[PDB]
């Protein structure tokens, strides 16, 4: 199971808007573009695109610049669709790309946008029709249906998207196709004469998809004392912890269960 995903953010300024774009293979970033830069270009963020040709990066750059130009117009037109003023600032978000299942055939294709953080228009799983959140979004919908937009995007997602995803995965297999198991341990903190805290740690793992659950005598438990959002370590790996409050002497009842792709089998720890 893999994915290539692009994320664009166009933020209006009171002249040229700021256009930022990022691209990920799975949970690794490999490309960046920022209009607020001195001479904006496509910039690699992973070694397996650093040795691509200069033609490759010229082309990617040209398409980033064209998308920035287009997003200025888009912010204006959205301002028109919702009949908004011009003093306030707004945001256009775009996400598109392809997800391969474990087969590893195309599982899904994505082309969806957002205005002011709200769903705008999204290409459906069929890659043949559109979900518009608003009748205003249906202006765009009818524009695209008249132009057979879904057709072209199906051609890209089923075609060159999966091809360059597979090819990136190839040239970076030493990186992208090696899962790091979580290094795990448990900490303990007496709170009071009645309570203590167990905290189950998972560190240095890749990809970010992981499952941490506390059980009591073999029964999943929910109170807890927290489950924390999976966070980036800063070196390409991720972190997460799950903690629970327990009676101050019954720690042995409580086990921690870790599921991660890089583990040959789910792990069970305890303090």
């Amino acid at each position: 199971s893999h994915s290539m995903r692009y994320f664009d953010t166009a933020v209006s300024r009171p002249g040229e808007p700021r256009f930022i774009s990022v691209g990920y293979v799975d949970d690794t970033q490999f490309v960046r573009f920022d209009s607020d830069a001195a001479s904006p270009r496509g910039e690699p963020r992973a070694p397996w695109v650093e040795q691509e040709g200069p033609e490759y990066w010229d082309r990617e750059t040209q398409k980033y610049k064209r998308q920035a130009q287009a997003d200025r117009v888009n912010l204006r037109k959205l301002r028109g669709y919702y009949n908004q003023s011009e003093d306030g600032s707004h945001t256009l978000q775009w996400m598109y790309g392809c997800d391969l299942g474990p087969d590893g055939r195309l599982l899904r294709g994505y082309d969806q946008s957002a205005y002011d953080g709200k769903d705008y228009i999204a290409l459906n799983e069929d890659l043949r029709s559109w979900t518009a959140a608003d009748t205003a979004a249906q202006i765009t919908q009818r524009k695209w249906e008249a132009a057979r937009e879904a057709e072209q995007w199906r051609a890209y997602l089923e075609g060159t998207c999966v091809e360059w995803l597979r090819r990136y995965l190839e040239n970076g297999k030493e990186t992208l196709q090696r899962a790091e198991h979580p290094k795990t341990h448990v900490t303990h903190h007496p709170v009071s004469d009645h309570e203590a805290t167990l905290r189950c740690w998972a560190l240095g793992f890749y990809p970010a998809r992981i499952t941490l659950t506390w059980q009591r005598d073999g029964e999943d438990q929910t109170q807890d004392t927290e489950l924390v959002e999976t966070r980036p370590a800063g070196d390409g790996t991720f972190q997460k912890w799950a903690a629970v409050v327990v009676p101050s002497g019954e720690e042995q009842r409580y086990t921690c269960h870790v599921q991660h792709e890089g583990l040959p089998e789910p792990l069970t720890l305890r303090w």
Binding site: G23, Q67, A70, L78
Partner: peptide
């Protein structure tokens, strides 16, 4: 690789 098509509303 980015698609040759731009988002256009």
């Amino acid at each position: 690789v980015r698609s040759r098509r731009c988002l256009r509303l």
